[PDB]
């Protein structure tokens, strides 16, 4: 078998791809019981759409960490990596779409003296 | 307020003082220093000279103020206005 991982701002996704139908198994729940947001589903299935291999791979995924959006992003990177492992010669199509790039955007560390990462306390001149 | 299991709190000094005060049915002014002591139904007639921070103010107990503290009846800060 083949197994890859996807990571998106503290969300880790392990994916197991087999050549069955378009059944989506996310920790024993389907793509509708999970991810009840159409934008998330489109973000999930975009690599399949640009590779046109929709509904020819049974997908088993392990999800932990982060929230629904981070999980969806990490899952999309996971399917991109699995596809690049299955059929190498499609790398142009996925890469120019950006699906092969890990997103290095993380929560900025809170800084002392500031209420938030960049928000500064209100200052009164008078 | 204080929990019910512990019961009301009264200092031992004025406790023994009022027990020896009511044993002969005569109630003279008692000079006290524990503002934290609760009013017990044994004080109904006794007159307390409770501390204030500067002096002692006479407090004559009634049935109404039972269950409170001697401290509520000795107002500490003095304010007359601006």
């Amino acid at each position: 078998p083949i197994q890859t991982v996807g990571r998106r701002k503290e969300a880790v996704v392990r994916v197991r791809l087999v050549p069955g139908t378009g059944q989506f198994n996310l920790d024993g729940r389907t793509l509708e019981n999970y991810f009840p947001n159409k934008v998330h589903q489109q973000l999930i299935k975009a690599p399949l759409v640009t590779v046109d291999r929709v509904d020819q791979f049974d997908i088993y995924a392990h999800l932990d960490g982060g929230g629904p959006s981070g999980q969806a992003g990490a899952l999309r990177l996971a399917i991109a990596r699995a596809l690049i492992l299955v059929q190498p010669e499609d790398r142009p199509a996925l890469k120019k779409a950006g699906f092969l790039t890990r997103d290095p955007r993380a929560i900025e560390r809170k800084k002392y003296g500031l209420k938030k990462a960049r928000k500064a306390p209100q200052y009164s001149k008078r | 307020p204080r929990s019910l299991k512990k019961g009301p709190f009264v200092d031992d000094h004025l406790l023994k003082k009022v027990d020896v005060q009511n044993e002969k049915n005569t109630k003279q002014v008692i000079k006290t220093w524990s503002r934290r002591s609760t009013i017990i139904p044994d004080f109904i007639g006794h007159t307390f000279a409770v501390h204030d921070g500067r002096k002692h103010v006479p407090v004559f107990v009634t049935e109404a103020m039972v269950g409170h503290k001697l401290g509520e009846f000795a107002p500490t800060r003095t304010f007359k206005g601006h």
Partner: protein
């Protein structure tokens, strides 16, 4: 912006309508990051418009945008130590941004008891050319024309 222009964010096409402009609309109506509620509001408004008119919602939404899209807008200019209202040509992107912002706000001040109905009514009246955003475009064009004397600088 002292060292040059900054790159623009390439927001994605909408899944259930396939148009850039509906995504721009949902980002305009977005508040506090509640994106799901914003998309629900926008989709409900579009479906209400489709039900009322009976045709595609994207075409009537585009018609509303062209009805409220401005072309001439006035900015204060300080030339030779003096400030005046100078009419200025508006780039297409800024005209679209202004049109969407006007639509969203003027829908927020409607009286249809719910944001979805307010938005649907505002887009419909802009499509027919009766909305308050259309009016606002009329006044901004009027102000641009009335100050045409200062167009030379």
């Amino acid at each position: 912006p002292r060292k040059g222009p900054a790159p623009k964010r390439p927001l994605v096409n909408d899944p259930v309508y396939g148009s850039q402009l509906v995504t721009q609309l949902v980002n305009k109506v977005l508040l506090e990051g509640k994106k799901s509620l914003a998309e629900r509001i926008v989709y409900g408004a579009l479906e209400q418009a489709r039900e009322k008119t009976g045709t595609d919602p994207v075409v009537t939404l585009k018609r509303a945008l062209d009805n409220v899209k401005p072309a001439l807008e006035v900015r204060s200019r300080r030339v030779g130590g003096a400030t005046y209202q100078v009419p200025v040509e508006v780039r297409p992107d800024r005209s679209t941004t202004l049109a969407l912002r006007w639509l969203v706000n003027f829908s927020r001040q409607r009286r249809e008891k719910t944001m979805v109905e307010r938005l649907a009514n505002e887009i419909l009246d802009a499509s027919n050319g009766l909305g308050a955003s259309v009016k606002r475009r009329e006044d901004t064009h009027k102000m641009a024309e009335a100050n045409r004397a200062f167009a030379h600088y």
